[PDB]
């Protein structure tokens, strides 16, 4: 007939909010990403099935991934600071063509340079030389200078470490947890009917690229598509594929490396002289495999758009080299990959491989920091990397030209957007164990 | 019959303790970080404490003294990420100014040129910039070179961050507190009749100053003198009073800015080319509103000593001129003023604007770290500063025999006194909960 | 049964695991900052009984967390100061003559270069005095520094002190240090008599290579630790039950000129000695080092044959960082060709000698091509008084038959000098919870 | 060890264009930095000048009383400058030397470190040139 | 084109100290660092004072050098029977300034 609170402590309740996250990393010389100060990973996926629960889980508002954009720089300038300075490189370079088996491609894009620098004291000089590439030498008025040297100063970033992606896990701190969701057919933002709570997340690997997703996580039945609004004409559509497709990149010039003194204990490490002919480097994707595989993708923008609608893939726009070029790492080295050969499409109703000429940089601004650059060590030796292309960075375009010759084309100007497809199964909420009830207590007087 | 023992927990017990304290601001770049600053609550409870006495005592609590070394690590964190300004000191040749010179700049502006390196390393340019007399000394048209350059040569400050003062609050940390005091008359020690009790502060300004107070908090009712030993000769008198007066310190110089590009990414802000007339820098006071406010401060001086004394007013002894003469910052600058005309008036017993010069020196110097300093870049335009005059520090003069002619006259030459003056009511003070009484306690026992 | 699990709330429950410390000091000093809570007046020594206890030498983690602190007080002891890059300059580079002994020709060099002045351009002719182990050649002739091939480094701030000041390391909350208090305590093996401190005694971290200096001493007997008494691949740890004077100095009234390297910033040179130069050299007693050296080889009859020829032999060679003496007598590092202390032998049944010392101002001493230090003259001359109670030894096995079983004095790394210092102690975690039977049973209300 | 070797032939007719090949040996690559300068002296009387050569990029500058009358040529091969002056007199009967202009190299982090003056540290044993029939 | 001012003969005598000036004109000052030469009867020149004051390692202690304003001076201490040679004074104007000479007897 009437009713009295009870305290209840430790019971289900969670409220969406925000944190910061952990480091994980299993079997251990020197990384950039888990460094050796780094607790190991748990042995046993704690993954909790739950029933009764509806979520709504809402990406593009999480701050993981701006999380993400915060720890990988914090890391990406501390590998930095313990380093090699290469600012009296950019002394007057004076540079010719080179010309040793050249091909017609190549003309005019390596140059043999040379300079005069200090030696381990700083009162004699030698007339040492060096290769360098196009794309980060330019004119003065033969004198040539560094594209860096009207910039911030900048070094070489220790080669004895390595760029290489390793899986690290997130784990939740105590009190809070992550939520998982399990649902197959689960887009953007709205309810998740089956989720799953969890400890700490899976292995995700810190790959950055501009256009394509490298070594990403399949997609389960379906390929997805992802919008801020599905009427947008920006902020980057994605998608995710289900089936993986290969490529290979490789750089077929016999490089060598050849070690340079800054001064004292300041040792700077240059091109040397490359061995046989000399090829343009280039990625190789199947041509029966891409096309097929973009074969799903467009049954797949056939119900968010209008049906019996035929669309048209083109070529990036414009912009710096930076956006228009597959940007992307192999075996240490960035590489700048024309992508025209595998978009252009042209798709309608009622429905052996392509090469791609790619161009090599040495020194890049690796994010949109204005105060520092990285010149990439000449590494040894034919390099072959192989990779799975999972997903797509599109931009469409405006016009009212009746709902038809709808153009897609790769573009990713924000480089955080690579993690989204990534971590878009997780969100972090805080656990509240208090919670109130009212029944028949009368708590009786001792 | 006896008595039985009791612990008693949350009961209100002081014990006098020494803490650090932590940031508060409003959340509105700075010098004052105040990015990672703590935001403030707007409501702090003024909490009148009853039938309570407090024993204060000012020059021993290291509240002042603790964040006196924040002054410090401010300013240093602010100046490492800074570009440095050490490569200049090449041989300065250096002629006068021009274009319808007056007789107060006559040689105190200089035009000079040297040489100097340019973005590539081996080649350089002749750049002019315009100098101070208090910036070079003579090497014996003649060549000139730095004052800082034999001793601690050092950086110039980064044009992102601004030197104006946001006034900060220090919320008391957990399980501490501290108490204001609400009296008239008021020493550095007291039994404070009225105590309040506050966590966060009202606004204090980490203004600096050398000679006169500005921006300070207003008093009361009535002029305080506050001093450690009024007999003695040696002890710092601080002086704060009701009616603030005010000055306009202005800059008529019209100037550009120039930038000379020293190396990769590191630019240096040179003054550029004094447009218009050239006037001297001054700070306006008015006549009767000054006259006043030290016929408002003779009265509460007369208590302390004799009726039948004279006090005169004159000017500082003699020294540097950094220490001697006034020294504070308006948009970036750092004027030194001579405050002959202020402090310059006898008393017996019983249209309207005072003028005063004032000299500009580019290059300020940290009053205790003589291992570095920071270079003040120049602001075009024209500076004004308007201000309020809340507080003066006078000196006794030695000697002063038969207890008659008791001259007062300026100094402080420290620089913890500034904020001393506006920490007058606080002391922070530790809390302990528990406490131990008799009574006729018989526990049941089970 | 009537049996009901109970728990029990401070309980001693001992574990083993790895920990962090804390500091002391016994009221500018980097080189241990000691910004740290100050020791208690009384320490809590509590001994217990009927208790035995395993306690493990040379894989504590003791050792291994300090060798890491002081590389890290190291560190941060180097970066408040200046760098010392506009030295890589060719000197011409000569002798010197005047008041030169015989064996001392040759070893200072009068030595000059150029250097810059306020202005950054103008230059002027500096000259200073170097060693020969500082200095190599090129081809009056051209020198340069032996750092600038490898990394560059800094000088040692002058107003700091090296000198060993006594700190403790004490365990923090929910922890403990047991001390063992035996006189002839084996170091691989259970302790029978362990007791308990809450903070150890002062620790002196002297970097030494060759000999120990003001380490703990034995009681009663000096005593022999090895892991592996059979191997020879492993060096000889042996504290002495008595404490031999040693007497070391420089008896060059050497001056000190600072001159300006840049900017304010300044690089304090060696200025021009006073009077005659002579050998520094190192002093050791015949009385007190022969019947010693008696005593450690006495024991050496208790883990072999005392039917075996026992000789002692000089250093096995190397680079000089490890085949000599090295350690920090008043902030200057001296290197002592130390002969004559380790060249006897024995049959199966006033008189001090001097020791050739050298000197040299860049030591590396941590096995780091990464950063180094030019050591600051010091004022006046250089004395000190201290006792040598550690030699670490190496066993030159590979012969048989017990014949001719020699040792030669090594010490080629640098953790075993505090592994004779932290021998008494070993970290456990205490676990204050446990259950037991007990035929209670908890009421129902 | 540099040594400025000398050569040139003795008796020459005048009014015409006399050769002067100076060689330095230890040099390899201490070539382009150094620039190279020709000095003659007439016998009982002062120094003269003749005008620069480049060391790597290669400049004529000459002496601003001998111009449009002697050329200076250099290969950056077998470290060689020739020397050349026409509209030789009675009156030039002197002796040449070939001599190094010294170089002061100094680089510090903040910026590259340059000279004032033209000395000359290395200089040649020379060669006398006589102007007769 | 303009010869520096420089006597053409000057007394020496062990034991002593002697003065060399040089000065031409100075209404601009460009001729900062002025440079001394010694040659020994014939042979070939060298550089003993160069930069206004330095000297190179090899040269004797005595070799001192002065830039008073715009007049030039150089001071030999403790002349002996070697280094009685020629000595010449060697400015910059233009190009290369060179001068007449002088002659220690």
């Known amino acids: 007939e009437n009713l009295w609170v009870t305290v209840y402590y430790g019971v289900p309740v969670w409220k969406d909010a925000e944190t910061t996250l952990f480091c994980a990393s299993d079997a251990k010389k020197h990384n950039v990403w888990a460094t050796h100060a780094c607790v190991p990973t748990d042995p046993n996926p704690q993954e909790i099935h739950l029933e009764n629960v509806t979520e709504e889980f809402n990406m593009w508002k999480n701050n993981m991934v701006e999380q993400m954009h915060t720890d990988i720089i914090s890391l990406w300038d501390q590998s930095l600071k313990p380093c090699v300075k290469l600012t009296p490189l950019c002394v007057t370079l004076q540079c010719t063509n080179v010309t040793n088996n050249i091909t017609d491609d190549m003309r005019g894009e390596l140059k043999n340079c040379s300079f005069n620098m200090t030696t381990e004291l700083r009162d004699k000089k030698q007339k040492v030389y060096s290769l360098f590439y196009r794309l980060d030498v330019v004119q003065i008025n033969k004198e040539y200078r560094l594209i860096n040297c009207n910039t911030s100063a900048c070094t070489q970033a220790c080669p004895k470490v390595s760029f290489e992606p390793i899986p690290i896990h997130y784990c939740a701190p105590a009190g809070f947890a992550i939520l998982k969701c399990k649902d197959k057919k689960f887009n953007g933002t709205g309810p998740c009917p089956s989720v799953s709570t969890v400890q700490c997340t899976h292995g995700i690997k810190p790959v950055v690229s501009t256009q394509l997703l490298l070594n990403g996580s399949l997609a389960e039945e379906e390929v997805m598509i992802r919008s801020e609004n599905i009427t947008n004409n920006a902020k980057n559509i994605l998608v995710q594929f289900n089936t993986p497709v290969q490529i290979n990149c490789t750089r077929p010039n016999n490089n060598t490396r050849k070690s340079i003194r800054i001064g004292p204990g300041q040792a700077f490490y240059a091109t040397g002289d490359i061995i046989g002919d000399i090829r343009q480097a280039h990625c190789n994707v199947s041509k029966a495999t891409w096309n097929e595989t973009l074969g799903k993708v467009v049954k797949q923008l056939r119900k968010h758009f209008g049906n019996n609608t035929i669309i048209r893939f083109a070529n990036s726009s414009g912009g710096d080299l930076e956006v228009t070029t597959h940007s992307f790492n192999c075996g240490g080295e960035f590489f700048y990959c024309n992508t025209s050969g595998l978009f252009n499409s042209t798709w309608i109703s009622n429905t052996d491989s392509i090469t791609l000429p790619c161009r090599i940089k040495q020194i890049i601004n690796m994010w949109q920091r204005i105060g520092q650059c990285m010149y990439a060590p000449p590494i040894q030796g034919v390099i072959r990397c192989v990779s799975n292309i999972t997903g797509l960075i599109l931009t469409r375009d405006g016009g009212s030209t009746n709902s038809t010759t709808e153009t897609f084309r790769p573009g990713g100007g924000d480089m955080r957007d690579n993690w989204r497809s990534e971590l878009y199964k997780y969100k972090v909420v805080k656990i509240e164990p208090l919670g109130v009830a009212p029944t028949r207590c009368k708590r009786r007087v001792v | 019959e006896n008595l039985w023992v009791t612990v008693y927990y949350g009961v209100p017990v002081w014990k006098d303790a020494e803490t650090t304290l932590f940031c508060a601001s409003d959340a509105k770049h700075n010098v004052w970080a105040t990015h990672a600053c703590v935001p403030t609550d707007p409501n702090p409870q003024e909490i009148h404490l009853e039938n309570v006495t407090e024993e204060f005592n000012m020059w021993k609590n290291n509240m002042v003294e603790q964040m006196h070394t924040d002054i410090i690590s401010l300013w240093d964190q602010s100046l490492k990420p800074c570009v440095k300004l050490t490569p200049l000191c090449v041989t300065l040749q250096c002629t006068n100014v021009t274009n319808n010179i007056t007789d107060d700049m006559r040689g105190e502006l200089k035009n000079c040129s040297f040489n100097m390196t340019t973005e590539l390393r081996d080649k350089k340019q002749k750049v002019y910039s315009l100098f101070y007399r208090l910036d070079v000394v003579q090497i014996n048209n003649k060549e000139y070179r730095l004052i800082n350059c034999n001793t601690s040569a050092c950086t110039q400050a980064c044009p992102k961050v601004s030197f104006e003062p946001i006034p900060i609050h220090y919320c008391a940390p957990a399980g501490f507190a501290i108490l204001k005091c609400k009296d008239k008359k008021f020493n550095g020690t007291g039994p404070c009749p009225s105590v309040s009790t506050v966590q966060c502060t009202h606004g204090i300004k980490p203004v600096v100053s050398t000679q006169l107070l500005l921006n300070g908090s207003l008093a009361e009712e009535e002029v305080m003198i506050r001093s450690e030993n009024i007999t003695n000769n040696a002890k710092n008198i601080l002086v704060q009073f009701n009616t603030p007066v005010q000055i306009n310190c202005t800059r008529p110089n019209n100037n550009t800015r120039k930038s000379i590009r020293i190396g990769p990414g590191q630019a240096f802000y040179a003054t550029g080319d004094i447009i218009g007339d050239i006037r001297q820098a001054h700070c306006n006071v008015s006549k009767a509103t000054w006259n006043e406010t030290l016929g408002k401060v003779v009265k509460q001086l007369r208590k302390h000593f004799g009726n039948n004394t004279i006090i005169r007013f004159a000017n500082s002894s003699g020294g540097d001129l950094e220490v001697t003469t006034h020294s504070f910052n308006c948009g970036g600058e750092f004027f030194y003023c001579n405050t002959s005309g202020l402090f310059n008036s006898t008393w017996i017993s019983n249209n309207d604007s005072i003028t005063l010069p004032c000299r500009i020196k580019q290059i300020i110097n940290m009053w205790q770290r003589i291992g570095q300093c920071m270079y003040a870049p120049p602001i075009q335009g024209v500076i004004r500063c308007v201000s309020n005059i809340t507080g003066l520090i006078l000196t006794r003069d030695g000697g002063s025999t038969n207890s008659t002619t008791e001259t007062f006259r300026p100094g402080g030459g420290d620089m913890r006194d500034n904020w001393r003056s506006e920490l007058y009511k606080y002391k922070v003070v530790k809390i302990e909960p528990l406490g131990v009484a008799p009574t006729r306690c018989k526990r049941r026992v089970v | 049964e009537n049996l009901w699990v109970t728990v029990y709330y401070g309980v001693p429950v001992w574990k083993d695991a790895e920990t962090t410390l804390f500091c002391a000091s016994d009221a500018h000093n980097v080189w241990a900052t000691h910004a740290c809570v100050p020791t208690d007046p009384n320490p809590q020594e509590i001994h217990l009984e009927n208790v035995t206890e395993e306690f493990n030498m040379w894989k504590n983690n003791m050792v291994e967390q300090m060798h890491t602190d002081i590389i890290s007080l190291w560190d941060q002891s180097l970066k408040p100061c200046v760098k010392l890059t506009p030295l890589c300059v060719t000197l011409q580079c000569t002798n010197v003559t005047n008041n030169i002994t015989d064996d001392m020709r040759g070893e200072l060099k009068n030595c000059s270069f150029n250097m810059t002045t306020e202005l950054r351009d103008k230059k002027q002719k500096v000259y200073s005095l170097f060693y020969r182990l500082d200095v190599v050649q090129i081809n009056n002739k051209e020198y340069r520094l032996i750092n600038c091939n490898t990394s560059a480094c800094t000088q040692a701030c002058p107003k700091v002190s090296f000198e060993p000041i006594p700190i403790h390391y004490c365990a923090p909350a929910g922890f403990a240090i047991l001390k063992c208090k035996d006189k002839k305590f084996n170091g691989t093996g259970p302790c029978p008599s362990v007791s308990t401190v809450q903070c150890t005694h002062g620790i002196k971290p002297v970097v030494s290579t060759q000999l120990l200096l003001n380490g703990s001493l034995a009681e009663e007997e000096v005593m022999i630790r090895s892991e592996n008494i059979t191997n020879n691949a492993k060096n000889i740890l042996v504290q002495f039950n008595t404490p031999v004077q040693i007497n070391c100095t420089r008896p060059n009234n050497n001056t000190r000129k600072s001159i300006r390297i840049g900017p304010g910033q300044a690089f304090y040179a060696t200025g021009d000695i006073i009077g005659d130069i002579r050998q520094a050299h190192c002093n050791v007693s015949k009385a007190t080092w022969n019947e010693t050296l008696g005593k450690v080889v006495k024991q050496l009859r208790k883990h072999f044959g005392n039917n075996t020829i026992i000789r002692f032999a000089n250093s096995s060679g190397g680079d000089l960082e490890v085949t000599t003496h090295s350690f920090n007598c008043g902030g200057e590092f001296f290197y002592c060709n130390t002969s004559g202390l380790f060249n006897s032998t024995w049959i199966s049944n006033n008189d001090s000698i001097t020791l050739p010392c050298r000197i040299k101002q860049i030591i590396n001493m941590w096995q780091r091509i990464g950063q180094c230090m030019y050591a600051p003259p010091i004022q006046g001359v250089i004395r000190c008084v201290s006792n040598i109670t550690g030699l670490i030894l190496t066993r030159d096995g590979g012969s048989t038959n017990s014949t001719t079983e020699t040792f030669r004095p090594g010490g080629g790394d640098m953790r075993d000098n505090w592994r004779s210092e932290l021998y008494k102690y070993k970290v456990v975690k205490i676990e204050p919870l446990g259950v037991a039977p007990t035929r209670c049973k908890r009421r129902v209300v | 060890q540099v040594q400025l070797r000398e050569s040139g032939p003795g008796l020459v007719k005048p009014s015409e264009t006399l050769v002067l090949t100076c060689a330095v040996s230890?040099?390899?690559?201490?070539?382009?930095?150094?620039?190279w300068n020709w000095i003659r002296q007439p016998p009982g009387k002062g120094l003269e000048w003749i005008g620069h050569?480049?060391?790597?990029?290669?400049?004529?500058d000459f002496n601003p009383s001998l111009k449009s009358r002697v050329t200076i040529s250099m290969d950056s091969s077998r470290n060689q400058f020739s020397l050349r002056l026409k509209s030789v007199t009675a009156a030039d009967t002197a002796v040449y030397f070939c001599?190094?202009?010294?170089?002061?190299?100094?680089?510090?982090?903040?910026?590259?470190?340059?000279?004032?003056?033209?000395?000359?540290?290395?200089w040649g044993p020379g060669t006398p040139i006589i102007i007769s029939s | 084109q303009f010869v520096l001012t420089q006597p053409p003969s000057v007394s020496g005598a062990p034991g002593q100290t002697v003065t060399i000036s040089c000065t031409g004109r100075?209404?601009?000052?460009?001729?900062?660092?002025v440079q001394w030469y010694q040659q020994l009867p014939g042979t070939a020149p060298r550089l003993v004072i160069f930069?206004?004051?330095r000297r190179p390692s090899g040269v004797s202690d005595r070799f001192s050098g002065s830039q008073s304003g715009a007049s030039a001076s150089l001071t030999i201490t403790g002349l002996q029977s070697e280094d009685e040679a020629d000595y010449y004074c060697?400015?910059?104007?233009?190009?290369?300034?060179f001068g007449r000479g002088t002659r220690l007897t």
């Open positions: 001599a190094r202009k010294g170089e002061d190299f100094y680089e510090d982090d903040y910026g590259q470190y340059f000279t004032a003056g033209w000395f000359f540290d290395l």
């Open positions: 230890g040099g390899g690559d201490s070539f382009g930095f150094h620039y």
């Open positions: 100075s209404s601009n000052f460009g001729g900062h660092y």
């Open positions: 930069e206004n004051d």
């Open positions: 060697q400015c910059y104007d233009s190009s290369v300034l």
């Open positions: 050569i480049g060391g790597s990029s290669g400049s004529t």
